[PDB]
Amino acid sequence: AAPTATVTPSSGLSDGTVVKVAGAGLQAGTAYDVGQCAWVDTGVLACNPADFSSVTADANGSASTSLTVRRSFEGFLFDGTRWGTVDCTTAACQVGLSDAAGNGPEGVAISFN
Ligand SMILES: O=c1cc(-c2ccccc2)oc2ccccc12
Numbered sequence: 001a002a003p004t005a006t007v008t009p010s011s012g013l014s015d016g017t018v019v020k021v022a023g024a025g026l027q028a029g030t031a032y033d034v035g036q037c038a039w040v041d042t043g044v045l046a047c048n049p050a051d052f053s054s055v056t057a058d059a060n061g062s063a064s065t066s067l068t069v070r071r072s073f074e075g076f077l078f079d080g081t082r083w084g085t086v087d088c089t090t091a092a093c094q095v096g097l098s099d100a101a102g103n104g105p106e107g108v109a110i111s112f113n
Contacts, residue, residue, distance in 0.1 A: 001025065005105035009095060012113045015071040015088075019095055021055075023105055024062040030099050031056045033078065036069045037096020037107070040083040045107075046075025047096050048086075069093055069110065078102050088112070 003025035010017040021034050033054040035047035050073060055065035075086040078098065086093075092111045098104040 003105070005097075007095065007097070007105070007108060009108045010069055010110040010112075012111065014112055015069055017069050019067045019069055019110070021067065021095065021097055022062070022064045023057075023097065024060070026057045026061050026063055026104070027099075028057045028059060028061040032063050032065075032097060032099050032104060034065050034095070034097040035067055036073060036093050038075075038086055038088060038091075038093045040075040040086050044077075044083060045096060046077060046083045046086060048073035049076045050074060067095070069095075 005023045008020035010019050035052040037045050037047035040046035051068040053065045055063040057063045072087040075083045094109040
């Protein structure tokens with residue numbers, strides 16, 4: 001079926017901005033982890049365990065959350081292993097939203113001003 005992932009990426013904003021994430025039409029009961037998961041290695045991405053707020057799907061099958069995009073964050077995988085400190089000063093960051101396994105909406109990139 002066609003889900004309804006409506007998120008608000010930080011385009012043209014500075015660091016410390018609150019990214020709005022609202023995913024509807026998901027699996028009610030599943031916990032979705034969302035963070036500023038950006039590129040950390042070749043084909044490898046990593047989320048931030050510092051300012052993260054995993055949201056569980058409600059009885060409507062929707063999950064709304066908000067994350068704070070930092071300039072530098074600790075990159076962590078979905079398994080629990082870290083990859084290193086990611087820094088988006090000269091590079092651009094992005095938002096990552098997926099379940100404990102790694103399924104969900106497509107990633108959206110963000111850019112500072
Ligand atoms: O920590 C990780 C975060 C993300 C990710 C999920 C959705 C959108 C962008 C990035 O993907 C991975 C893929 C493999 C291993 C770790 C990760």
